[PDB]
Amino acid sequence: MQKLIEDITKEQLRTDLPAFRPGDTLRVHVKVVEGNRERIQIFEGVVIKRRGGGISETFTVRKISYGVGVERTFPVHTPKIAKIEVVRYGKVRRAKLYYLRELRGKAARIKEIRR
Amino acid sequence: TKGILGRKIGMTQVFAENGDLIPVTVIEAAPNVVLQKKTAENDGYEAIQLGFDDKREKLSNKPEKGHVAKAETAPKRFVKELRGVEMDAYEVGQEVKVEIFSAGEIVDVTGVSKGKGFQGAIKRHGQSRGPMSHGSRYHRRPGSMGPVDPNRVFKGKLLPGRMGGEQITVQNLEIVKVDAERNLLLIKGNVPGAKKSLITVKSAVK
Amino acid sequence: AVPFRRTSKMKKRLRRTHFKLNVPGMTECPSCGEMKLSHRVCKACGSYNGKDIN
Amino acid sequence: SYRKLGRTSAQRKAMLRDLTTDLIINERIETTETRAKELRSVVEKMITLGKRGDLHARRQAAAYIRNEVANEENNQDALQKLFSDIATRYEERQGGYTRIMKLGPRRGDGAPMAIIELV
Amino acid sequence: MIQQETRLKVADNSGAREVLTIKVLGGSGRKTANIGDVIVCTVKQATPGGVVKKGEVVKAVIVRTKSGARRSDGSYISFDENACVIIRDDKSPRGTRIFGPVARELRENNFMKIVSLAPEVI
RNA sequence: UUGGCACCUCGAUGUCGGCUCAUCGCAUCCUGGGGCUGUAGUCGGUCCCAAGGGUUGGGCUGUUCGCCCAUUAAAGCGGUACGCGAGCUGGGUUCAGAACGUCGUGAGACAGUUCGGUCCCUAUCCGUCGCGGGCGCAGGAAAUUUGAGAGGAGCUGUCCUUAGUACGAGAGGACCGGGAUGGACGCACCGCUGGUGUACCAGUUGUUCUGCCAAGGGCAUCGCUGGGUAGCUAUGUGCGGACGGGAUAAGUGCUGAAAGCAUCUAAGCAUGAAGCCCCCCUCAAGAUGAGAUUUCCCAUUCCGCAAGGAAGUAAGAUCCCUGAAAGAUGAUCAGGUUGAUAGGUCUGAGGUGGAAGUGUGGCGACACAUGGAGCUGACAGAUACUAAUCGAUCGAGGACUUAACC
C-alpha cells in the first residue's frame, strides 16, 4: 500500500532543500504573486515544528516581528518555495517547540551550537 | 455513460502544477472484464456487468465458474452493473483498462460508506443535546417523541440505531491524474469507504 | 414501568422460541473414540491433533 | 485496539507481569482463552530479548520480569533462566513461541480455558 | 475564528485600545470570522486622546488572528493576537497608521489602503 | 383569547415559561408567479395563485407578550391536553418558616410585595428506530438487477458584466440575461490545520522495592508537565440541493359563437410558478400480484398397489475456529493448511528524540563522543515460525389442468 503511495509521488520529492534540524533559526525564500509579478520575500525565524510523512511533511517557521508573533507553515515539497538556508543551527532537547509560542525576550533563545 | 470500478486505499496529497494542493484518493482498478452484456430484448433493460478481483481456486463456486466461462477470462469476486451505457461499443469478455478517463472531466463516485456501529441519537442524526449543567439530567437523548393526542410516534421521527454501512454517492467529482501503467485513478476529493472497499466511478450528469 | 396486563399463556410461550439452546460443536475423539468438542482437548483422551499432552 | 480483560490501566500490566514470570518458571499455565491471546502477543516479545542477550538487552526485561525463584539447588532467578537456557533453546526459530491448547469450560465461571506451552 | 462577545486588541492610533464584537456581517447567523470579514463592534477601551472614544458602535475589519488562513498553497498564516483595524464603514480605514503585521489575505478584497499603510504585509 | 354551560375526569388527567425533537394548516414575513396603481426609474401600496424550503443573535423580565441593540432576503401567524414533566429543568405562582404595608380588638388573612423550599419507575402491549432466526416464493442452491412502493434532498445574499445603458430635468437608477464568489443547513471522510489518543517514547518530584552505586520497578487522579502513531473526530478538507421535461394553477392569450357586433368561450388550440409528476440520490420482491435474466446440480435407494413417506447425497451452506475494513449478541465480512486470515518475526513508514554501557572534560551538578541513536499499542511489507486439527450434521429428486408447438 504505502510503497505504491510514494512510488507515485517520488517524482515530486523536491530534493533541493537542505535537511535541517527541527528547531533552529532559518530563512526561507518564498516566491509569491503580488500584482501578476513574481517576487521573492525572505522569511526569517526559528522552526517550531517538523512533522508529517512522505510528500505531506509540513513544517513551520515562527517569526516574532513588531511584537506580534507570526507563525507560518509550509509543506516541504512545494514549488512555491525557492530557497531555504540554515543561518544558525540549534540544540533543543525537545522536538516540537510549542512552548515558544508564549515566551518572548531572551527566555526564548536557542543557543548556537557551532555547526 | 461509462464507468469502471476499483479498490480504495487511502488519501494522499498531490501537487497540481501550482501551489494548489488537492485531496487525492488512490483508486486502483485492475482491468475489468465484462462478464455479461444484458440486452433489452430479453432482460427488459439496457445494461452491462463488470467484474473486479483476482479470485483464487478455493474461493469460487461452480455457478460463478459457468457464468464466467462463456467469455472465459477469469473468475472475479465483485460483480456490479451499470444501467445506461453505449451497448454498441462493447462485447462480452472485453478487457477495460483505465484508458477511458482523462485528468480533467466531471466524474461521479458512489460507494459503500464506513461503519460507526451502534451509536445513537446525536452522532447518528446530528441533533443537539440539553444543557450539561444547571441541574439538568438530560443530555445525549433523542428529544421528545411527539404530541399527546395521535397516540403514536410518526414514521419519520429519528432515533438511535446503527450509523453507517449504507451505500452513499458523491456527485460531480473530478479526476486529478490518470496513471494507467499501474492501473491507478486519482480523484479530487474525499471518497466514502474504508480501506479496501469498492467504488463505482461513473461520469456524472453535469 | 408497569405491565398493564398479565401475559397470557400464548405470548409467554412465544418468547421461549429464541430462548432455546442448541447442541454445541461436537465431533468424535480420534484416539479414544468418544465424543469430542470441536477444536479443544478430548479430556478422556487427553489428546489434541496427535498428542496426549501431559 | 487491543484487549483490557476486566482490569484497569494499571492492573492489567500488573497482571501480565505475573503471567510471564510464572510462565517462565512453571513452564505451562492454565488461563482462559483471552488471557492466552494476550500472552501469545506479549511473551514472544520477551523471548526475543533472550536472542539479543546483551547488556542493554538485559536491562529491559529486568524492568519487566519479577524476582522469583526458578531453580532451587541453583539459585537461578526467573531473569537468569530467560538468558541462560532459554536463549540456547531458540537460536533457530523465528517467531511463534507459544502454543494455545484450548480446554473446556471452567466450572463456576463458564470461562473458556486454555493451556500455553512454550513451543 | 472570532465569535460574538470576544475582545480584540486594536491595531491603529485612531483612538481605541480594546474592542469587543457584536455580530459578523455574513448571513442570517454566522458563528466565526477568520480574516477579512467585517464586524460591527463596540469600544470597551480607548486612549485618552481619542477621536473615537469609549462606548461607540463601530464597524471594523479583522486583520490578524489566532486563526488559520488556508491559502491554496497549504501555508497557514496564524498570528498570536486577535485584532482589528477600525474602518470608516466602507472599503477604507479611518486611522492614521496600522500597528504591527497585516495578513496578506486582505488583498483578496480591495482594502488596499490598509495594504498601502501596512508596515509588514505578512 | 376574555368568557358563558357544568357533559366526561376529585378510588388523582401534575399547571404557566425556556431547553430537547419537530410535525401540521395558509388568512404569507422572504423567496416564485402575476393584475391594477395616485406603477418615470429604484423602492412601493394592494388584492390573486402559491405551503417545496427558510424563518437570526443578544440586554432586561420567571417570563409569554413587548420595548430595545445589531443584522437579515425574511424575522410569519396559529394549532397539536394554551403540543412535549413514565424526556429535562423548578425561576414562576400554590404547602407550612420569615418579614413589610394595609384589614381585623383577635387567632389570622391578601390574583398586593419580598426571602427559602425532596420532581419518583427496572418497560407488558400498541407505536416507532435499527438489526436478525424460521418458513413462503410447486426442484434445489450461487451472484447481479428491473422496479411496484416509500423516504430524504428540495433556502438563498453580495459582487462583476451588459450598463451608468432605457427612464429621469437632475438626483438617482433598472429590468431581462451571462460569469464569479459566499453565508445557512445536508451527506462524506483523516492526506493538511489542530482535538482525543489510560500496553507509545522523553524529562522530573516524594517514597518504598530489586543487597548497594548505577540502572529500573510500584504507588501517588494516566502522579503531574511537554509531545504523541493508528483509530473515532469538527470548527479542517471535498462535493451536495444541478440542468432540465410533462401537465396545470392565478394570469396572459389567440380563435369564435350563442347574441350580424363585441367576447382569453361551449367546441379547437398555445403559453404560463421556488407549486405538482418524473429527471437527481438513497431504501426496496414477504410487490403472498412473491418479478426478470446468468450458470450449477439432476431425477438417486427404500417402502407402498398407488397416493405418500425417510435417508443417504449433488450444487452449495452451516456448526466450529484465526479474524477484523464489519461488530449490542446474532448478522455482514477476509480465511481455515494448494495459507499470508490473525499473532510473532525481519525490514521499512510515522512518532519520540540523542539509549544504557563505555571513554573523556569537570572539585561536582553536569556536559561530550560512541550515534538521527534508543524504544515503539493497534500501521503495510515480506516469512509457514504459531495456532485456523481432524470431524460433523443440514441440504434436490421435482404435482395437477389446458394451450402451444414438438
Swiss-Prot record, chain A:
Q: HAMAP family annotated for this entry?
A: Ribosomal_bL19
Q: Which gene encodes it?
A: rplS
What InterPro entries does the entry give?
Ribosomal_bL19, Ribosomal_bL19_CS, Ribosomal_bL19_sf, Translation_prot_SH3-like_sf
GO CC terms: cytosolic large ribosomal subunit
Q: What is this protein called?
A: Large ribosomal subunit protein bL19
**Molecular function GO labels:** structural constituent of ribosome
Q: Which organism is it from?
A: Bacillus subtilis (strain 168)
What is the purpose of this protein? This protein is located at the 30S-50S ribosomal subunit interface and may play a role in the structure and function of the aminoacyl-tRNA binding site.
Q: How does it assemble?
A: Part of the 50S ribosomal subunit.
Keyword entries, A-Z? Ribonucleoprotein, Ribosomal protein
Which GO BP terms apply? translation
Query: Sorted alphabetically, which Pfam families does this protein's record hold?
Result: Ribosomal_L19 (PF01245)
Instruction: Report the family membership.
Output: Belongs to the bacterial ribosomal protein bL19 family.
Keyword NAD (UniProt): no
Q: What PANTHER family does this protein's entry cite?
A: LARGE RIBOSOMAL SUBUNIT PROTEIN BL19M, RIBOSOMAL PROTEIN L19
Top-level lineage group: Bacteria
UniProtKB/Swiss-Prot annotation, chain C:
Name the family the entry cites. Belongs to the bacterial ribosomal protein bL32 family.
Q: Does the keyword Ribosomal protein apply?
A: yes
Iron listed as a keyword = no
Describe, as the record does, how this protein assembles with itself and its partners.
Answer: Part of the 50S ribosomal subunit.
What is the name attached to this protein's record? Large ribosomal subunit protein bL32
Q: Which gene encodes it?
A: rpmF
Q: Which UniProt keywords apply?
A: Ribonucleoprotein, Ribosomal protein
A UniProt-annotated Pfam family: Ribosomal_L32p
N-terminal signal peptide: none
Q: Which GO terms describe its cellular component?
A: large ribosomal subunit
**Which source organism?**
Bacillus subtilis (strain 168)
UniProtKB/Swiss-Prot annotation, chain D:
Q: What keywords are assigned to this protein?
A: Ribonucleoprotein, Ribosomal protein
Would I find Cytoplasm among this entry's keywords? Answer: no
Any single GO CC term annotated in Swiss-Prot or TrEMBL for this entry: cytosolic large ribosomal subunit
Q: Which Pfam families match?
A: Ribosomal_L17 (PF01196)
Classification via InterPro entries: Ribosomal_bL17 (IPR000456), Ribosomal_bL17_CS (IPR047859), Ribosomal_bL17_sf (IPR036373)
Provide a Gene Ontology MF annotation, just one.
structural constituent of ribosome
Name one process (GO BP) from the record.
translation
Q: Which residues form a coiled coil?
A: none
**Which SUPFAM superfamilies has this protein been placed in?**
Prokaryotic ribosomal protein L17 (SSF64263)
PANTHER family listed in its UniProt record: LARGE RIBOSOMAL SUBUNIT PROTEIN BL17M (PTHR14413:SF16), RIBOSOMAL PROTEIN L17 (PTHR14413)
Self-association state and partner proteins as the record states: Part of the 50S ribosomal subunit. Contacts protein L32.
Family note: Belongs to the bacterial ribosomal protein bL17 family.
By its UniProt entry, which NCBIfam families does this protein fall under?
L17
Name of the molecule in the record:
Large ribosomal subunit protein bL17
Q: Which organism is it from?
A: Bacillus subtilis (strain 168)
Swiss-Prot record, chain E:
SUPFAM superfamilies referenced in this protein's UniProt entry, alphabetically: Ribosomal protein L14
Q: Which HAMAP family match?
A: Ribosomal_uL14
Q: Which CDD domains match?
A: Ribosomal_uL14 (cd00337)
Gene name on record?
A: rplN
Family membership: Belongs to the universal ribosomal protein uL14 family.
One Gene Ontology molecular-function label? large ribosomal subunit rRNA binding
**Source organism of this protein record:** Bacillus subtilis (strain 168)
The keyword NAD is annotated on this UniProt entry = no
Keyword terms of this UniProt record: Ribonucleoprotein, Ribosomal protein, RNA-binding, rRNA-binding
Q: Which residues form a coiled coil?
A: none
What does the record give as the function of this protein? Binds to 23S rRNA. Forms part of two intersubunit bridges in the 70S ribosome.
Under what name is this protein listed?
A: Large ribosomal subunit protein uL14
| Gene Ontology biological process terms from the UniProt entry | translation
Q: How does it assemble?
A: Part of the 50S ribosomal subunit. Forms a cluster with proteins L3 and L19. In the 70S ribosome, L14 and L19 interact and together make contacts with the 16S rRNA in bridges B5 and B8.
Q: Which Pfam families match?
A: Ribosomal_L14 (PF00238)
Q: What Gene3D superfamilies does UniProt report for this protein, alphabetically?
A: Ribosomal protein L14
> InterPro entries in the record, alphabetically?
Ribosomal_uL14 (IPR000218), Ribosomal_uL14_bac-type (IPR005745), Ribosomal_uL14_CS (IPR019972), Ribosomal_uL14_sf (IPR036853)
Q: Which GO terms describe its cellular component?
A: cytosolic large ribosomal subunit
Q: Does the keyword Magnesium apply?
A: no
